[PDB]
């Protein structure tokens, strides 16, 4: 049946296989007519040099412009021949190439896919075309303020690290960019073991690996070096950044402090504190009777339009903080509230509200787990993160670990009397000076 | 685990159930009442009603309710369209009973307290506004008016003089008017039938009354052009399509994938769509065209929604429209259709494979049929489409009264008389 305890038990398990040249293989059988076929690569901007900045990004567009065996636009005209959707995306710490398809024609898919991973048509016809679009887009990118401030946010904390830099990279490089340097980074980090493969669907494991087998047993896809594994712990900057522009109607805010990396015990312990403190938006039907003190007040006096809290844990790093939007005269009061919640947690919190947080995260956890692609998608990062580990039922056990002291003792570390980072975007001016925020981190006991 | 179990009642309300193994345990509740069922003085009610969700039941104080769902960790949802409003809720495998019980009290036990009703007056706009970020949003709503007279022409949103207009009572009737155990349909997912089967007949047997179906929507075309400040004019051309649940509805559902391009590849301008290609060839730099097909119970509409720049729109329309002619003239590609069939079948299954989406697909059949059809049968029926069908299907869209909706800077904007 479906019973929460038993519900953990029966799931198609994590599968793993390993080829010779460093490629990883893995899978799970969902008993489904379709399969998400995907690839995840850990080559980051944090690898990328100061010219390489944004190049892989530029590269990202290029694959589908045609390839070696398949010149321009011969690539998709086979893809849509099947009617299988196709998509690709990248990130500072990862890049994911993937396919969503019926399990039938997969024998082409990966073979189609494997071609793309390395064999590529590098043709300055597409280059200039794509060189333009990005430049076109580079300027357009000022239209969504959300992404904008985060760029400021990193650069203010991580200044002096490749992690602190634009994903698309600065503009002039894109013009200056030449496809040989790509071929470098093409050659550099697209080797295995850097490469990782997974999939989920009616596929099981074997019948994946056999038809994994030889390209990309393989086409090398190698293992040599690129030194090893070139990375560094990044510096964390108590600081502030402000772009003051008063014309605009509203002013975003972001505030955060650094935290533990991907792999780390406490990462889960802090999953709940956010869920507990929750979030608010203009548009809810929750009104003023919600349990979240923020969603209660921020709806009550509409001290903000909306806000949400984020977590981002890098390899070695993690990011805890919120993002809110409030009236140009309403900024202060959002804050003096927001320091209330974090601070009061670190001392006076209570096991009751723990539970309501506890349940939610269980739900959200179980929730996201439906669907081919997301299932498929966990593996790739997880592999690049914790390896094969999909400790599904364990996560539950992990949930049972968290305690009142725990959360307090955890937050005591990462909040009480620290140096926060401050990002801002106009019409900021109301926003108090740092020296307030700083004194405002540690209570005086009030 | 166990496959689709759907059960007629004496009330005729289908209680459909499956058994899952998953700890996610959800339930959903469908109702026939859409915007078409609002009257000239009843306007926006459902749209307002759709914000009646969180309010004070007759079974409990809304406070207790709201603090109830969170501390449990469950989640509530509400959804409507021009036709079928749907009340969705979900929580952990274990606790559904507490939550499930409240699903009734809302739909079972209304209370409209004149004070509690007032605070929701401010709310509509802020909701109503954010939907109109998307220009296409505003464009569509206008369209149902142009092509109809009465029913589907009804907005999903509140015309603004209608704002202060709505009393608790007006709601209160439409509550019980359009509610009945004949129309109500309940769907379980992760929960066993008998538990589902138990309480279903218990509370949910009420009347009777009113499904009132007097809305045939009477397709009546025309065109509407709003003068606006956008640089990218938006417009669409529609000759009425057929009713839902028909090979024609499938034929157009096939006919779309002919020209109709959703991107199957990121950023890729879809070449297999001749429409964009046959356009983009003779045409100049940015623009977009996609084909619009939608059907409701009694009927639906087929069209294509264009986005272009100031001068281009007509030729953007015309060529594409002229390109439509090409198809209507006896142009055919069986493999393309075949590929399109492959697209559709996949696109269908890829659509359906999603449970929550399929959760709708369950009751979307129910209020329509009340039975279940394996997608296989669909996939079979997908095959059943003849080409001359899709041939003459498009011919219809050419062969019949067509309608336009246009908004933006209109200086160069042609009418349908230019067409």
């Amino acid at each position: 049946t479906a019973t929460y305890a038993q519900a953990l038990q029966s799931v198609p398990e994590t599968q793993v296989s390993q080829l010779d040249n460093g490629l990883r293989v893995a899978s799970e059988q969902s008993s489904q007519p379709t399969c998400t076929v995907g690839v995840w690569i850990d080559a980051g901007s944090r690898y990328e040099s100061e010219k390489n900045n944004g190049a892989g990004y530029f590269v990202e567009h290029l694959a589908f412009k045609g390839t070696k065996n398949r010149p321009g636009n011969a690539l998709e005209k086979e893809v849509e021949s099947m009617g299988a959707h196709l998509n690709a995306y990248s990130t500072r710490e990862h890049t994911a190439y993937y396919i969503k398809a019926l399990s039938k024609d997969l024998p082409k898919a990966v073979e189609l896919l494997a071609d793309i991973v390395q064999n590529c048509s590098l043709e300055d016809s597409q280059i200039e075309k794509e060189r333009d679009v990005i430049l076109q887009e580079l300027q357009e990118n000022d239209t969504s303020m959300r992404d904008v401030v985060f760029n400021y946010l990193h650069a203010t904390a991580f200044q002096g690290t490749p992690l602190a830099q634009s994903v698309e990279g600065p503009s002039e490089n894109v013009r200056k960019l030449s496809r040989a340097d790509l071929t470098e980074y093409l050659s550099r980090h697209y080797k295995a073991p850097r490469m990782v493969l997974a999939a989920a669907g009616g596929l099981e494991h074997r019948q994946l690996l056999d038809l994994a087998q030889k390209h990309f047993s393989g086409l090398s896809g190698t293992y040599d070096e690129d030194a090893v594994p070139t990375l560094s712990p990044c510096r964390f900057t108590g600081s502030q950044i402000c772009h003051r522009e008063d014309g605009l109607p509203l002013a975003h805010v972001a505030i955060a402090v650094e935290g533990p990396g991907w792999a780390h015990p406490d990462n889960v312990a802090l999953q709940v504190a956010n869920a507990i403190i929750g979030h608010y938006d203009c548009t809810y039907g929750g009104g003023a009777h919600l349990s979240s003190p923020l969603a209660s007040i921020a709806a009550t006096n509409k001290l903000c339009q909306s806000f949400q809290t984020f977590n981002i844990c890098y390899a070695d790093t993690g990011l805890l903080g919120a993002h809110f939007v409030c009236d140009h005269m309403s900024i202060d009061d959002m804050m003096f509230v927001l320091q209330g919640q974090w601070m009061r947690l670190c001392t006076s919190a209570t096991e009751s509200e723990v539970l309501r947080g506890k349940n939610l995260l269980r739900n959200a956890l179980v929730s996201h787990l439906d669907g081919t692609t997301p299932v498929c998608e966990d593996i790739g990062r997880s592999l690049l993160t914790y390896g094969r580990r999909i400790p599904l039922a364990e996560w539950e056990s992990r949930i049972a670990e968290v305690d009142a002291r725990v959360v307090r003792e955890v937050c005591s570390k990462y909040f009480y009397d620290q140096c926060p980072a401050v990002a801002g975007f106009g019409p900021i001016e109301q926003l108090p000076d740092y020296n307030r925020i700083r004194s405002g981190m540690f209570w005086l006991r009030f | 685990p166990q496959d689709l179990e759907f059960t007629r009642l004496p009330n005729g309300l289908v209680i459909a159930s499956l058994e899952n193994y998953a700890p996610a345990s959800r339930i959903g509740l469908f109702i026939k009442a859409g915007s078409r069922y609002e009257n000239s003085n009843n306007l926006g009610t459902s749209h307002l009603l759709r914000l009646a969700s969180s309010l004070t039941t007759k079974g409990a104080s809304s406070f207790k309710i709201t603090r109830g769902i969170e501390a449990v960790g469950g989640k509530l949802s509400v959804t409507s369209t021009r036709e079928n409003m749907a009340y969705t809720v979900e929580c952990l495998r274990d606790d559904v009973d507490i939550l499930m019980e409240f699903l009734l009290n809302v739909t079972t036990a209304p209370e409209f307290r004149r004070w509690e009703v007032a605070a929701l007056q401010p709310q509509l706009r802020i909701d109503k506004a954010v939907a109109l970020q998307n220009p296409q949003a505003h464009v569509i709503e206008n369209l149902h008016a142009a092509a109809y007279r009465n029913a589907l022409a009804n907005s999903l949103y509140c015309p603004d003089y209608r704002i202060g207009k709505v009393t608790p009572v007006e709601l209160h009737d439409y509550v019980q008017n359009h509610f009945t155990s004949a129309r109500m349909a309940l769907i379980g997912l992760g929960v066993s039938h008998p538990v589902l089967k138990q309480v279903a007949e218990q509370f949910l047997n009420i009347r009777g009354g009113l499904g009132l179906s007097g809305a045939k929507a009477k397709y009546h075309g025309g065109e509407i052009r709003e003068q606006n400040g956008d640089s990218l004019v938006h417009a669409a051309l529609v000759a009425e399509s057929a009713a839902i649940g028909s090979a024609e509805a499938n034929a157009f559902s096939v006919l779309q994938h002919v020209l109709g391009a959703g991107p199957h590849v990121k950023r890729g301008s879809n070449a297999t769509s001749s429409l964009y290609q046959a356009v983009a060839k003779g045409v100049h730099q940015p623009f977009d065209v996609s084909a619009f097909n939608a059907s409701y119970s009694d009927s639906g509409l087929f069209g294509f929604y264009t986005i272009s720049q100031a001068a281009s729109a007509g030729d953007v329309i015309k060529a594409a429209y002229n390109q439509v002619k090409t198809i209507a003239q006896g142009n055919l590609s069986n493999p393309d259709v075949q590929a399109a069939k492959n697209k559709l079948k996949a696109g269908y299954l890829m659509s359906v494979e999603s449970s929550e989406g399929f959760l709708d697909e369950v009751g979307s059949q129910a209020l329509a049929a009340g039975s279940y059809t394996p997608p296989s049968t669909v996939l079979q029926q997908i095959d059943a489409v003849a080409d001359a069908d899709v041939i003459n299907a498009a011919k219809k869209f050419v062969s019949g009264r067509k309608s336009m909706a246009a908004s933006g800077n209109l200086g160069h904007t042609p009418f349908i008389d230019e067409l």
């Binding site: 938006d281 548009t283 809810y284 039907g285 929750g286 | 759709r50 914000l51 969700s53 969180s54 709201t66 769902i69 989640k75 509530l76 949802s77 509400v78 959804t79 409507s80 369209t81 021009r82 969705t88 909701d127 954010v130 939907a131 998307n134 296409q136 949003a137 569509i140 999903l156 779309q256 109709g260 996609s290 084909a291 619009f292 097909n293 939608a294 509409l301 069209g303 294509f304 929604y305």
Partner: peptide
């Protein structure tokens, strides 16, 4: 094209889609 579309109100999130 579209389904055509939908609307959403509910509780914890909020949105509109097509």
């Amino acid at each position: 094209g579209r389904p055509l579309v939908a609307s959403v109100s509910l509780n914890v999130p909020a949105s509109v889609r097509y």
